[PDB]
Design a protein around this ligand. Structure first.
Ligand code: VO4
Ligand code: VO4
Length: 517
């Protein structure tokens, strides 16, 4: 219900209390499964609102009459779930003095909780909510360069293929896939305060997957339901093409809304083996979509937000990649990999071998290693990057030894080359592999990740020295500290884990003894 100029009608989203816990379609209608048809234009439809009008939200003022405010200043707070304090912000574009502000009380979002007098003297009435055109990226002061990692708790990601806050990552396959769980681990454990999940597609016709068993789903950081810090955006198959395409703009706009408050948010865009009909045209001009995609992904970022006070937020984006053929030379994957800075190569050969997080350490990548190393170094461990590089070099080396051995067998391999396989094997089993279903190992804090890495690297250093001093590998393979090393991931007390470093040294020292110089 508006004019023509460029891209369709108004085309907007409402941003305020009860986005959280809400399950929406691709254009922000509350959830019963429904339909919008279009092109680059607009829609018809039915009567459901977005944020509810009836609901009365407690509003705490955070400014007084006489305050100068700009686009994005926080004028009040609303507890909205037991996890998220919602921040009421002067919408972008508006600045002035506060002439009127509501009082500690309970109000429905339709109320006016403030009036601002702009410099030319116009009076603006501010609601608890605000409207925003999904296709326009919400403004901000500055986009900071990648530098703070999105800690995921999952060893292989955090060590070898870090995501940066405000970074962009891709991962195979549909999220609903039962072959792996890192997708869930990512959603549930990343230190983003707010999760915006765009759950594309669905299976069968009984109707009840991600819909039912999710208001029940527990948030392990707080014991409160994960819904209490999530916004769900449903893409069903019986929904219409245009609503699905709009859904990710809807999601990212909502995400930008939460970063604007000073929150870190993660946005997960699911995806399915489905042919988008680009190759329907013949004469009238394409790869123009590749750039629509790009433009999407570069709406991600950690930013200085609008406001008077210095404030930072981020939108890190994780996107599912599911080529029509399960191919992976399909344009969908090329197109994504040309934009994203991080690929987590989920791998069916790993899953079959029950190597879990089935993330291939050889074909994955992160362009954020350098950008985050300083954070690790300054906060957790000065040796961080050196250590990841050394482990990566050992896994790389193992790869080559494996190749060669496929051909000529293991029988001719020298002790030093066996030692390398022994230790790379520890590295694969004691570090890479993580048990997502263990109550301790489901999450691995930075401090524990680096200690564990020290223990393995120290073991490796000692192993090589031992071999070089003539100690049989078989005597190293049996070293009793190995059994402890293979269990360290289940240990909660980081300093007990650390103590394995002296245990190793001692056990190796005994071994040097036994084999006089
Ligand atoms: O569930 V998978 O992303 O390893 O095909
Ligand atoms: O993304 V892969 O399942 O070809 O490692």
């Amino acid at each position: 219900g508006e004019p023509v100029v460029g891209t369709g009608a108004s085309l907007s989203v409402e941003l305020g209390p009860r986005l959280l816990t809400s399950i929406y379609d691709g254009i922000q209608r509350p959830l019963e499964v429904i339909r919008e048809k279009t092109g680059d234009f607009i829609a018809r439809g039915v009567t459901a609102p977005a944020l509810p009008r009836d609901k009365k939200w407690h509003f705490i003022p955070k400014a007084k009459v006489g305050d100068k405010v700009v686009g994005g200043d926080i004028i009040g707070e609303v507890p909205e779930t037991s996890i998220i304090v919602h921040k009421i912000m002067v919408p972008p574009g508006i600045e002035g003095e506060i002439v009127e502000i509501a009082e500690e009380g309970d109000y429905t979002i339709e109320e006016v909780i403030a009036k601002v007098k702009t410099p030319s003297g116009e009076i603006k009435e501010l609601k608890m909510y605000q409207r925003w055109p999904v296709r326009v990226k919400r403004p901000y002061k500055e986009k900071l360069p990648p530098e703070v990692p999105l800690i995921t708790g999952q060893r292989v990601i955090d060590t070898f293929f870090p995501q940066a806050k405000g970074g962009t990552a891709a991962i195979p396959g549909p999220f609903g896939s039962g072959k792996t769980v890192t997708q869930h681990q990512l959603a549930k454990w990343s230190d983003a305060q707010v999760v915006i999940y765009i759950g594309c597609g669905e299976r069968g016709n009984e109707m009840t997957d991600v819909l039912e068993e999710f208001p029940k789903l527990k948030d392990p950081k707080t014991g409160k339901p994960l819904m209490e810090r999530t916004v769900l955006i449903a893409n069903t198959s019986n929904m219409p093409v245009a609503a699905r395409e709009a859904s990710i703009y809807t999601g990212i706009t909502i995400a930008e809304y939460f970063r604007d408050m000073g929150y870190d948010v993660a946005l997960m865009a699911d995806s399915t083996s489905r042919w988008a009909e680009a190759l329907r045209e013949i004469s009238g001009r394409p790869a123009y979509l590749a750039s629509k995609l790009a433009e999407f992904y570069e709406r991600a970022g950690r930013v200085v937000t609008l406001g008077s006070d210095y404030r930072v937020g981020s939108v890190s984006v994780i996107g599912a990649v599911s080529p029509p053929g399960g191919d992976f030379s399909e344009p969908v994957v090329q197109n994504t990999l040309r934009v994203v800075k991080v690929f987590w190569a989920l791998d069916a050969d790993l899953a079959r071998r029950r190597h879990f997080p089935a993330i291939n350490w050889l074909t994955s990548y992160s362009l954020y290693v350098d950008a985050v190393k300083d954070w690790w170094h300054k906060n957790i461990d000065p040796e961080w990057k050196a250590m990841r590089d050394k482990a990566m070099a050992l896994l790389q080396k193992e790869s080559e030894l494996q190749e060669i051995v496929r051909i000529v067998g293991p029988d001719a391999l020298p002790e030093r080359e066996r030692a390398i396989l022994l230790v790379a094997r520890m590295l694969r089993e004691d570090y890479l592999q993580q048990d997502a279903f263990d109550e301790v190992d489901t999450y691995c804090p930075p401090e524990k990740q680096v200690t564990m890495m020290r223990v393995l690297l120290n073991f490796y250093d000692k192993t090589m020295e031992a071999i070089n001093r003539g100690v049989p590998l078989e005597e190293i393979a049996k070293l009793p500290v190995r059994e402890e090393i293979g269990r360290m991931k289940f240990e909660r007390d980081v300093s007990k884990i650390r103590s394995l470093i002296d245990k190793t040294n001692e056990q190796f020292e005994e071994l040097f003894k036994k084999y006089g110089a």
